[PDB]
């Protein structure tokens, strides 16, 4: 029993981390085989952060300008590319705790767990999710950017987000591992608004139904409604629509419980248009969307790695 | 900015863990140096955990009866021993990924982390702090007994929790790493209550205080209180009272916000007189109380290990 924010075991990346240093700037990079990843603005100096040409900025930088430490033993850098907003680096040593990985690029909805490091040395780890408006609300401080946030299947790591911005409104923006952000966020010192935000529906109804196989049922009622009339409600209160892949999708906790999935939306529309009333569910006073079905089947499941 | 429940990086924990098998029976163990720490009901059969006598089932025990599977290498156990609730079991190889450790036996109202395991595989991480009733707030199932909690200091672990038992109301207990319960339990098959349980004060303060930090101050007030007024309204909310000893832990972060101690807990008395009404602080609807002011400094600050 219980249901908490549960991150992936973070020992695969750990031993991945580094410390990538530029002239003044220093970050954080990902050693997999013989390369080293990073956001490419570590060859960024203090006054053209504003709109820097990288192009024009890399090819005057060489191997030598690249300091790459791993715990405290340097890896020489034996060449240098850029693809998209991640600088890859090439050294002379492949990372003998390389783990089994991928790299993807993740859809809206989907979480992941944040290894927050600095100077190359984990700090914390806590779960994600992509917002619809492809932020996330993490934690980070200065020196966290190439900081990764990753997924775990069996032995395998999916790699599917590094750090590189604090927005104005205090959520941060970042890329894939190829370099590719999420969202229309670019890589320069300038203050960048995200789109406005909705919550994640389906990962409601996971949550509730987690709600359910932990043995609260307050929330339910004996109603059904139909996907459209759901719908209606949802746009009401600046909920994602639900889709038929959402409902399919949510089809194995539906069989667990015994709880049609629209009988569920019924509940959820219930707890949109009459609130809590002072009432908790799985020890929050707000429904939670940062729980995918898989993260519910996961952890009231107890699947390993 | 942001602020989330954090765990430490888990790697350190991931390399010591093992599974214990005993009969039918397999739970996690602890792997340090050349002992294997678990949960002494290994050895335990179907039908006499309602009250074992755990010496006179040890001394019918041999080292050939325990099976220790580090990964998928066997362990061979060359030598065993009980210590309060806990087995020790000596085996023939030292875990050459044992890190600096130490046991510690924590009090009421600190956090940890904890990896929650299944056969011997780490399946999550997330943090927990120990109640006032000495339970935890878990996510444990069938299977999980013997799985740890830790801090992380420097490159230090320090183990403080191992998981043995869920009470009937969906709460959890276990021990410290030399096997003393953490409140009245005993590890036997039976249905335990646990002493009504309390709000943590002081960490009730470093959250508020952590969301100053973070740019929420709605919730200040131009009032201040006294530490009697404000127990007297403590009590009457279950709230812990607030001593000396925590005013002062909380002076870093009175200082670091400008806000004293007391000044805080007129906005507590507020809070908890009247509600929030319709706001949140730092994403949640209720008053959290299980980061500590040291949760709130290194996440704050960006403390790494
Ligand atoms: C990240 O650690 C980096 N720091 C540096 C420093 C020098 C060169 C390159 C980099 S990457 C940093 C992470 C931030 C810091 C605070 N909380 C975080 O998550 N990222 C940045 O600082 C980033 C660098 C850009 C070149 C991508 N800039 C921003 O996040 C940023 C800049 C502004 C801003 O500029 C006028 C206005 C408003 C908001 C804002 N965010
Ligand atoms: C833990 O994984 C163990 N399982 C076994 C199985 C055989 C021998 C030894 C052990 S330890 C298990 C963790 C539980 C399971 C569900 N969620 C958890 O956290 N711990 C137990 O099962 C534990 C064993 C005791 C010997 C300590 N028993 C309980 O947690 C328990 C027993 C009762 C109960 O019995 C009548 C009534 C109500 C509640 C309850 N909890």
Known sequence: ???????????????????????????????????????????????????????????????????????????????????????????????????????????????????????????????????????????????????????????????????????????????DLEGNFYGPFVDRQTAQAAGTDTTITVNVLAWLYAAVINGDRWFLNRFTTTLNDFNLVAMKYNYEPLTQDHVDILGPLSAQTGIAVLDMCASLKELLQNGMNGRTILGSALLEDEFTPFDVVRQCSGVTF
């Open 1 to 175: 029993s219980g249901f908490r924010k549960m991150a992936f075991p973070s020992g695969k990346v750990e031993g991945c981390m580094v410390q990538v240093t530029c002239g003044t700037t220093t970050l954080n990079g990902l050693w997999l085989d013989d390369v080293v990843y990073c956001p490419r603005h570590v060859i960024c100096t203090s006054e053209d952060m504003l709109n820097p040409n990288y192009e024009d900025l890399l090819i005057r930088k060489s191997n030598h300008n690249f300091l790459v430490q791993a715990g405290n033993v340097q890896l020489r850098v034996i060449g240098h590319s850029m693809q998209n907003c991640v600088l890859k680096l090439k050294v002379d040593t492949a990372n003998p705790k390389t783990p089994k990985y991928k790299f993807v690029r993740i859809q809206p909805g989907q979480t992941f767990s944040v290894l927050a490091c600095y100077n190359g040395s984990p700090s914390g780890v806590y779960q994600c999710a992509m917002r619809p408006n492809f932020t996330i609300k993490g934690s980070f401080l200065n020196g966290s950017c190439g900081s990764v946030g990753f997924n775990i299947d069996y032995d395998c790591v999916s790699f599917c987000y590094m750090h590189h911005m604090e927005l104005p409104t205090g959520v941060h923006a970042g890329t």
